[PDB]
Each structure stands twice: as C-alpha cells, then as structure tokens.
Amino acid sequence: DKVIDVSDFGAIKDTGSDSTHSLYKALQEAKKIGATKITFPKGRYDFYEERAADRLMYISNNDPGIKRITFPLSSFNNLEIDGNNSTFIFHGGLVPFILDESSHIVLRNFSIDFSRAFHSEALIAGAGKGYLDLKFTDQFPYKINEAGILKFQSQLDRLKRKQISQDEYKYEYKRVLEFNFALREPEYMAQDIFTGNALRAEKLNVVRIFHPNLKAKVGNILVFQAKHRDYPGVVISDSNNVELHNITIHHAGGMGVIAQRSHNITIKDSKVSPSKGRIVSTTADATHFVNCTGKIKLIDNLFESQKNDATNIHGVYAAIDKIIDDKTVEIKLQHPQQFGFDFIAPEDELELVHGASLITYETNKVVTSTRVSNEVTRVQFIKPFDSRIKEGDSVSKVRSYAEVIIKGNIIRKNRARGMLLNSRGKTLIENNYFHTPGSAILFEGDANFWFEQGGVSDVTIKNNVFENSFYSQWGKGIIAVDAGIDDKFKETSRYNKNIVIKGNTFKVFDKAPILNLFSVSNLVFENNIIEKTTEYPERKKYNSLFVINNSDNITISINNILQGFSEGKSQLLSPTTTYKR
C-alpha cells in the first residue's frame, strides 16, 4: 500500500535462507505502486550471491568491476527502508547497498555484516628475527598450500573446491598492522608493515609467518589488511537527499559509506564498530565523500576500529594529459581507484591548477566534453586557457562545495587519521571526541598521487576533545597540514584559509605538534585547554606544540590555558619551524 512488508514477498526471518529475491520483488513493487516505505519484521536476514543483481560500477577510492548488489536502489525516489533493528548478514562478495541516481532515500534501523571478514586477525603468540607465531580463531579460515604460502579462505567434490578456490581473491592481504590487545587500537607507534599478498608460512607440528620486517609484541593482535576494496557497505552515487539513521556497519570490503557526486547526505546515530570476535570494523574509511554538494551532516555517530580514516570530504583533480590546441585539452584520471569518475560536463567551471604548487592559475568555462575511456576525457573551453598551463598540471571542478557539519561524533581506535578536511565549503567541526593514532584532523589534498582536491576556505573547529591523539605516525601532529605542495612553492602557495580553532580540550601525552601548519592564511587558535597526560611514553623527537612554516596571519593567542606542564605557557605557545631545535 503505502508501506510494503518484505515478509509479504516471501522473505522469512531467522531461517538462514536467502532473502535476496524476495527483497528484489518487494523493491520492484515499491517502485511500481509508489510506496514510500519498506519494513522488515525484526529478525535476522541472510543474503547470498547466487540470485543478486549484477551491474558494472565505478566507485571512487574503491575498486571497480562487476558488483552483485543486494539492495540495488537505482532510480528510486521517496523511499524509506526501515529494518526495525534487524540484522543483515551478507555471504561472500556482495555490495549491500548501491544508491544510484536516487532521491530522498532514508535507511534506518538495521546492521550490516559479512559472515567471513575480508581481512583476518590472529593472536601473536611469539616473535623473533623475521617471524611471528600466530593463533587464528575459527572465523578466519586459512590454508597453507604446498608452496608454503598462507592463503585465507571463505571456508574450510571438485566443483565445491573450484568455487572455494575462486573465493581466495576476496581474502587476499597486502600489509599487516599490530593492534594492542587491551586497548583494541593500533599499537602505540606501530606502523603498517608491507608484505604483499603472499607470506611464507608453516604450521608448527599455531602458524609461523616469515618476513624480514615483521616485529610485534607477543600477546597483541595482528591484522592482515584486505588487499581489495570490492565490497563497500553503502554506495551513494549521483543521488540526492539521502539519510542514514541508526545504521550499524560491522564490516565492509572497503569503505563503510562512500558518496560520489551526490547532494545532501546525512548520517546520524549510526556506528561503524566490530562484530563479535573481531578487533577491526570496515577494511577502509568509515565514511568518504567525493565531489559532493549541499549539506553533508555527520551527527552523533560512533566510528571505531576501521582500517582507515573516519571521514574524508574532497574533490577530484584530473591531470592535463594532452594539450590539443589553445582551447582544448584531454584530461586523464590518475589514481586507479578514480577510473570511471565522469564529472566534467558542458557549462561547468573548472579550476586550472599548477600541479606542484596547488596554486590556481585561472578558472575557465567548458563548452563541450567527450568521455574517451574510463581514464581520458577531452575538454573544450570557451576561451583559450592560461598560456602557462603545461601537461602535468590539473583541473578540478568548481562546485557549490558541500557545507560540512560534523557534530557529536566519537572517533577512536582506527588506523590512520580522524578527519581529512578537504572541504572548501563552510565547515563546522564541533563537539566530537578524537582518539586516533594518526592526525585527528588533517588538511591534505594533492595533484601528484591521490589527485584529491582540498584547500579549505572556512573552517570552525570548536569544543572538541582530542585525547592522546596522534599517538603513532600517520600524520604530522594532532591538527596538521600535509598538502602536496613542493617546498619550493610553500612560501607563495596559500592553500588553506580562514580557520578558527577555539574552545577545545587537547589532552596530550608529549610535546608533538598540536598544530603543524604550512601554506595557511588566517588561523586563530584561542580559548583552548591543553592538558598534559602520561598515557603513552613521550617521544624525544618532538619538543614543540606549534610548528608553523610559510604561513601568514596565524594567531596562537595568549588566552589559551595549559595544565600540568613543567614550563610556562609563553615557552609552550611559542611557534617553531622544527619539531625540536
């Protein structure tokens, strides 16, 4: 009627049977009749590959290919999916949700998990020169083949072997990271150890893995980082007015929520958090927004234990590959996880940017655009473009940049950074808790490897708590700039502008930078409380709370408060150019 009950289409809870086809039929009926809601009788629902719809997808900062989709929400309008706090379990290579060219879609009250994680975890039972001894629990099956290589499996007749073998790709790894057993966070100062996808291994007649760079503390947990990003949790693509309310994402092969080229997204009262027996949630970013517009609201969420940043809101740079004539260029997407990102349309305004400095030469209007491939697009401008532009420079679309509201979130226990603020729109970061091994807030962006467009223009960071963040090495300080500006251009490049950091509590354990800035104009750091702790060992390489280079109009104000420090506030609040002296 107005509300469609998925059990009227044969999806039965708690049985363990596949509910994919019944779900599909309920979705098509909702589109046929104009229903505004689908409800699940509260229970457990399982979804498998065999009857899932298949679609080519490019998904920014994730891996492209054929996706099997359990909720294929393409061209839906004005539809709410209320799971009534049901539990959704996905078996194998599924993308749970893709919202494609949809509008006013509300997702509420369910959880997402996969029956076997894409990553794997092990207890570290011993260590030595070039090896670790590991105990795996049952939920991470593996085989050690005749070659002496550790290969994780989907599960423990010739065609069943063949399909299991075909599953091996999904559980490939590329690096390992040590997690502290007691704190359930990346181990203090441990770093990613690259291994590649094949580790020599042997079972001691416990599994021993061999690699020259292995180093960890016994009793900690070793995480094998999933190599691939093929199965993100919720994809929001070319869509508008999407809300996620009380969604729990226990796991994904890649990001928890990834949005590209969409407009108005809210994520509220949701959580990314591990399920029973796991120390890791999603295998990449909890959330992530590419070329999005309107309001992006992250309200009152819990993001913990994912293998990457909690959020990143940014644009796409594309390199100028070939100059065809004075008015025409071919641009090329650079990073493999950007291939297929079409964004340049007739009448768009583009920034033309010098690659090594991130200085904008000019803006220009595009009159025509032709997609040549999933890499190359040809672009014709209305007037001849600036004569200084060379091949190797980049373009970025001048958007109505997203207004970013990030309020009331708890961000902790994840690998890497807290928030990558590459939002050039009006940005508000207020009343969040950060406990991250990397930079809690990082202004990044580059046009040489990730080709992500950042460059802040209006940022307010007010009344957050930064507790012993940046306790490892993914970043350059608690709040830091690592934008891709060559040293030669730092003094003249001003990439991030107009930043107010007021009313925060920084609980710090050593004298690593609270602020580490370059190429900034107009930043005010006032009315903050800085308070010394002993939560982690002090690192002797840091002796400066405020490292500032190649910036202007930076006020580190006198009205900040310092508690528990040996030295006086006038030494401690005084900027250096270096970490030490």
Ligand X SMILES: O=S(=O)(O)OC[C@H]1O[C@H](O[C@H]2[C@@H](O)[C@@H](CO)O[C@@H](O)[C@@H]2OS(=O)(=O)O)[C@H](OS(=O)(=O)O)[C@@H](O)[C@H]1O[C@@H]1O[C@H](CO)[C@H](O)[C@H](O[C@H]2O[C@H](CO)[C@H](O)[C@H](O)[C@H]2O)[C@H]1OS(=O)(=O)O
The reply on whether position 194 binds ligand X by CB under 6 A is yes
The reply on whether position 268 binds ligand X by CB under 6 A is no
- Whole-number Cα distances in Å, 510 to 344, 450, 501, 530, 578: 46, 31, 20, 11, 16
Between 225 and 467, CB nearer to Cl ion: 225
Residue selected from 356, 479, 508, 573 as contacting Cl ion according to rule CB under 5 A: 356
Distant-in-sequence, close-in-space partners of 260: CB < 8 Å, separation ≥ 6: 59, 60, 235, 236, 237, 238, 289, 290, 291, 292, 341
Between 284 and 298, CB nearer to Cl ion: 284
Binding mask 479-508 for ligand X (x = CB under 6 A): ------------------------------
Between 208 and 261, CB nearer to Cl ion: 261
| Residues 43/13, Cβ–Cβ less than 8 Å | yes
* 444 interacts with, out of Cl ion, ligand X, none, CB within 5 to 8 A per kind: ligand X
- Whole-number Cα distances in Å, 580 to 120, 200, 201, 539, 545: 39, 41, 42, 11, 10
Binding mask 311-340 for ligand X (x = CB under 6 A): -x----------------------------
Binding to Cl ion in span 73-92, by CB under 5 A:
74, 77-78
Beta strands in 300-358 (DSSP E): 302-304, 311-325, 328-332, 349-354
Rounded to a whole number of angstroms, the minimum distance from the CB of residue 450 to ligand X is: 5
Between 284 and 548, CB nearer to ligand X: 284
| Residues 467/492, Cβ–Cβ less than 8 Å | no
Between 92 and 418, CB nearer to ligand X: 418
Rounded to a whole number of angstroms, the minimum distance from the CB of residue 412 to Cl ion is: 18
**287, β-bridge pairs:** 257
| Residues 27/71, Cβ–Cβ less than 8 Å | yes
Q: What is the Cα Rg of the chain in Å?
A: 25
The reply on whether position 309 binds ligand X by CB under 6 A is yes
Rounded to a whole number of angstroms, the minimum distance from the CB of residue 51 to Cl ion is: 15
CA-based nearest residue to 315, from 456, 419, 426: 456
Q: Give the integer Cα–Cα distance in Å for 44 and 65.
A: 29
Neighbour tally for 259: CB within 10 Å: 27
The reply on whether position 156 binds Cl ion by CB under 5 A is no
Between 178 and 309, CB nearer to ligand X: 309
* 547 interacts with, out of ligand X, Cl ion, none, CB within 5 to 8 A per kind: none
Residue selected from 19, 22, 180, 308 as contacting ligand X according to rule CB under 6 A: 308
Binding mask 315-344 for Cl ion (x = CB under 5 A): ------------------------------
* 178 interacts with, out of ligand X, Cl ion, none, CB within 5 to 8 A per kind: none
Number of H-type helices and E-type strands within the chain: 4, 50
Q: Give the integer Cα–Cα distance in Å for 211 and 190.
A: 16
Total of chain residues touching ligand X, rule CB under 6 A: 16
**421, β-bridge pairs:** 313
Binding mask 423-462 for ligand X (x = CB under 6 A): ---------------------x-----x-x----------
163 φ, ψ (degrees, to nearest 5): -70, -40
Rounded to a whole number of angstroms, the minimum distance from the CB of residue 452 to ligand X is: 6
Between 80 and 285, CB nearer to ligand X: 285
* 557 interacts with, out of ligand X, Cl ion, none, CB within 5 to 8 A per kind: Cl ion
Residue selected from 18, 185, 285, 304 as contacting ligand X according to rule CB under 6 A: 285
Q: Exposed, middle or buried by CB within 10 Å (0-12, 13-18, 19+), for 146? A: exposed
The one segment of 108-116, 120-128, 186-194, 473-481 that binds Cl ion by CB under 5 A? 108-116
DSSP labels, 114-170: ESS-SSEEEEEEEEETTEEEEE--TTS-EEE-TTSEEEE-S---HHHHHHHHHHGGG
Rounded to a whole number of angstroms, the minimum distance from the CB of residue 152 to ligand X is: 16
Distant-in-sequence, close-in-space partners of 574: CB < 8 Å, separation ≥ 6: 546, 556
The one segment of 67-75, 79-87, 408-416, 464-472 that binds Cl ion by CB under 5 A? 67-75
Between 401 and 474, CB nearer to ligand X: 474
Residue selected from 46, 192, 375, 393 as contacting ligand X according to rule CB under 6 A: 192
The reply on whether position 474 binds ligand X by CB under 6 A is yes
> β-strands 257-260, 287-290: how paired?
parallel
Tokens 């280079």, located at residue: 549
Binding residue per annotation — 347?
no
The two three-digit tokens of residue 74, written as one number: 């393409």
* 309 interacts with, out of Cl ion, ligand X, none, CB within 5 to 8 A per kind: ligand X
> β-strands 173-180, 185-186: how paired?
antiparallel
Binding residue per annotation — 230?
no
| Residues 418/439, Cβ–Cβ less than 8 Å | yes
The one segment of 308-316, 358-366, 389-397, 511-519 that binds ligand X by CB under 6 A? 308-316
Residue selected from 558, 566, 568, 570 as contacting Cl ion according to rule CB under 5 A: 558
Binding to Cl ion in span 526-545, by CB under 5 A:
540-541
Residue selected from 19, 20, 22, 61 as contacting ligand X according to rule CB under 6 A: 61
The two three-digit tokens of residue 507, written as one number: 């609980």
The reply on whether position 174 binds ligand X by CB under 6 A is yes
Rounded to a whole number of angstroms, the minimum distance from the CB of residue 34 to ligand X is: 38
Q: Give the integer Cα–Cα distance in Å for 142 and 158.
A: 19
| Residues 522/496, Cβ–Cβ less than 8 Å | no
Task: Name the residues that contact ligand X, by CB under 6 A.
Answer: 61, 174-175, 192-194, 284-285, 308-309, 312, 416, 444, 450, 452, 474
Residue numbering of the annotated binding site? 101, 238
Task: Name the residues that contact Cl ion, by CB under 5 A.
Answer: 7, 13, 41, 72, 74, 77-78, 98, 100, 103-104, 115, 275-276, 284, 356, 401-402, 423, 540-541, 557-558
Residue numbering of the annotated binding site for Ca(2+)? 101, 238
